[PDB]
Amino acid sequence: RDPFMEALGLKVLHLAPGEAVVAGEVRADHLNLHGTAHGGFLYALADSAFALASNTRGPAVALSCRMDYFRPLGAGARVEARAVEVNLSRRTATYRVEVVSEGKLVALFTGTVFRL
Amino acid sequence: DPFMEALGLKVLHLAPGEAVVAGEVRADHLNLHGTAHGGFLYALADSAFALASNTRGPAVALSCRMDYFRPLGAGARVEARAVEVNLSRRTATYRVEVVSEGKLVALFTGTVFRL
Amino acid sequence: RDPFMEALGLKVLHLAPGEAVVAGEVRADHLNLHGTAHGGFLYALADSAFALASNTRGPAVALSCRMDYFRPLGAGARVEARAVEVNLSRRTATYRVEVVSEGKLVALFTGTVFRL
Amino acid sequence: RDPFMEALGLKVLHLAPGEAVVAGEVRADHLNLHGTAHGGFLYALADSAFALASNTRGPAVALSCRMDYFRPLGAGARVEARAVEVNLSRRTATYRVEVVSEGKLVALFTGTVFRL
Numbered sequence: 234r235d236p237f238m239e240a241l242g243l244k245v246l247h248l249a250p251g252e253a254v255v256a257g258e259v260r261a262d263h264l265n266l267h268g269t270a271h272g273g274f275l276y277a278l279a280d281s282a283f284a285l286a287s288n289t290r291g292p293a294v295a296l297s298c299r300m301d302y303f304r305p306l307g308a309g310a311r312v313e314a315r316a317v318e319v320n321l322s323r324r325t326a327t328y329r330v331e332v333v334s335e336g337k338l339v340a341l342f343t344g345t346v347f348r349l
Numbered sequence: 350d351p352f353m354e355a356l357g358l359k360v361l362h363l364a365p366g367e368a369v370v371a372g373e374v375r376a377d378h379l380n381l382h383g384t385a386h387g388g389f390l391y392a393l394a395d396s397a398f399a400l401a402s403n404t405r406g407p408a409v410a411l412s413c414r415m416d417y418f419r420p421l422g423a424g425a426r427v428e429a430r431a432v433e434v435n436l437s438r439r440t441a442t443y444r445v446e447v448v449s450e451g452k453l454v455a456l457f458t459g460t461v462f463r464l
Numbered sequence: 465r466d467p468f469m470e471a472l473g474l475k476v477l478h479l480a481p482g483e484a485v486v487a488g489e490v491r492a493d494h495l496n497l498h499g500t501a502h503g504g505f506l507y508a509l510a511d512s513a514f515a516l517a518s519n520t521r522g523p524a525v526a527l528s529c530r531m532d533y534f535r536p537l538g539a540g541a542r543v544e545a546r547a548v549e550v551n552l553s554r555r556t557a558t559y560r561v562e563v564v565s566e567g568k569l570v571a572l573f574t575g576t577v578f579r580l
Numbered sequence: 581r582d583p584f585m586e587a588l589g590l591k592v593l594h595l596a597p598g599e600a601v602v603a604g605e606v607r608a609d610h611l612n613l614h615g616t617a618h619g620g621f622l623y624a625l626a627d628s629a630f631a632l633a634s635n636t637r638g639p640a641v642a643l644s645c646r647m648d649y650f651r652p653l654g655a656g657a658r659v660e661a662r663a664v665e666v667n668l669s670r671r672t673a674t675y676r677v678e679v680v681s682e683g684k685l686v687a688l689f690t691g692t693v694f695r696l
């Protein structure tokens with residue numbers, strides 16, 4: 234169980250070795266002053282998939298993450314983050330997470346973990 | 350800001366090209382390991398980043414980096430301090446330090462496209 | 465013609481709209497103190513493909529780039545970087561550049577440009 | 581100075597615990613196809629100061645590096661990479677490297693190594 238993911242209404246859809254798919258919906262409480270999905274909401278979603286995918290290999294903590302924003306989203310938008318393992322080392326691992334909504338690539342997340 | 354209120358974040362300081370936001374790690378901000386969720390610390394840093402950049406005019410985030418140095422438990426008071434590192438016509442870059450009790454918890458680097 | 469690419473012995477293997485492949489070989493002058501390819505060389509290779517691919521869309525300048533290192537390479541290693549377009553906006557574009565050697569992902573590069 | 585630094589004509593101006601400064605000049609063979617300093621040359625400069633600074637703490641390997649470009653440079657420009665330690669832990673370290681030329685912040689480099 235992940236308290237923050239549930240607080241944000243994010244749901245784990247699928248889990249597997251080095252991979253995970255998390256889904257959610259942009260709600261009124263996830264917006265910024267401009268009426269669009271807060272950058273922190275989209276990151277949390279992708280970061281959640283990243284955390285889940287990396288821990289399927291054992292305990293791991295976030296080291297460095299990059300988030301590239303491409304499309305703004307309004308409330309009501311359905312979103313999915315799919316994390317895929319691009320590198321797995323004895324001490325670190327890196328994952329690419331695509332944030333997608335209605336077939337559109339909303340953002341691209343890249344993250345590396347430190348394997349405890 | 351709906352999301353900021355949702356996370357219980359508060360704006361402490363706002364000036365030209367800078368912003369300071371504070372919050373506290375609550376039970377609902379923890380991850381599967383019982384520590385502050387990376388998404389919560391980023392959201393905090395991202396908030397200061399958005400506020401600081403917007404003192405220069407409307408802008409949209411392009412690329413952001415977050416480096417985590419220390420984990421935090423529930424109850425920890427945390428703060429995000431944003432400073433402008435570069436300002437141009439169409440872009441701006443900010444450094445945001447996430448600190449808790451004098452310790453650097455994480456480092457955020459973000460660039461925006463100025464509208 | 466790209467002077468730095470030439471200085472480093474990098475060759476353009478392919479160039480098409482929003483895409484590029486650049487290849488080279490790790491030489492003695494590309495090594496760090498440990499005897500492996502300097503992070504700057506690998507980055508320069510990835511960056512070159514990134515620059516070429518992004519400019520097929522029109523003059524563009526780099527804004528932010530990320531480089532994640534997975535495997536070290538020694539002199540004599542053949543390496544190639546494939547740049548692919550992940551997002552194309554009117555004012556910006558983002559590319560993924562896989563750096564490989566013998567079918568293995570040596571490094572991953574992500575870069576965004578400002579479209580003039 | 582490792583082989584790549586020598587090839588690029590880079591000089592070490594300062595080296596102390598957790599910090600380093602590397603200087604170089606943009607030569608004709610350091611230019612991109614646009615006639616300005618190649619993004620890979622500026623990064624190699626930053627990456628060199630980064631590598632020197634991190635290894636003052638002992639052997640370390642680069643994991644993730646970010647490079648943000650702010651201003652273009654022409655041939656003849658004197659440039660410096662000034663690296664400072666922002667975090668130091670048992671198994672990792674992160675450094676901020678400012679790339680400056682003639683009093684201007686040309687680029688910002690952020691990088692994290694894994695300490696061996």
Ligand SMILES: CCCCCC(=O)SCCNC(=O)CCNC(=O)[C@H](O)C(C)(C)COP(=O)(O)OP(=O)(O)OC[C@H]1O[C@@H](n2cnc3c(N)ncnc32)[C@H](O)[C@@H]1OP(=O)(O)O
Pocket residue numbers: 280281284293294295296347380381382384385386387388417418419420421452668669670671672
């Ligand atoms: C987000 C979803 C869950 C997935 C997991 C996450 O991403 S959770 C949120 C995002 N990520 C994080 O919080 C990771 C933070 N980073 C770290 O903990 C570390 O940098 C690291 C494990 C990657 C590397 O640490 P090292 O192996 O080098 O070991 P080191 O002992 O030097 O630890 C570094 C610093 O963290 C502290 N620290 C480590 N474990 C701690 C703990 N359980 N409780 C309190 N503090 C702790 C140390 O005291 C030190 O702070 P001092 O020097 O001040 O004494």
Ligand SMILES: CCCCCC(=O)SCCNC(=O)CCNC(=O)[C@H](O)C(C)(C)COP(=O)(O)OP(=O)(O)OC[C@H]1O[C@@H](n2cnc3c(N)ncnc32)[C@H](O)[C@@H]1OP(=O)(O)O
Pocket residue numbers: 436437438439440515524525526527578612613614616617618619620649650651652653
């Ligand atoms: C390496 C591959 C080559 C392909 C392109 C690259 O990636 S080259 C290497 C990597 N990238 C860079 O160096 C990117 C540098 N960044 C920039 O030029 C800029 O920040 C930018 C275009 C992204 C955004 O600038 P803005 O749109 O905000 O406008 P702004 O007016 O503030 O920028 C003014 C500065 O840029 C200059 N400038 C303007 N047009 C220029 C041009 N066509 N060629 C060179 N330089 C130019 C001005 O002279 C001044 O430099 P002075 O104050 O010196 O007079």
Ligand SMILES: [Cl-]
Pocket residue numbers: 298299413414529530645646
């Ligand atoms: Cl990054």
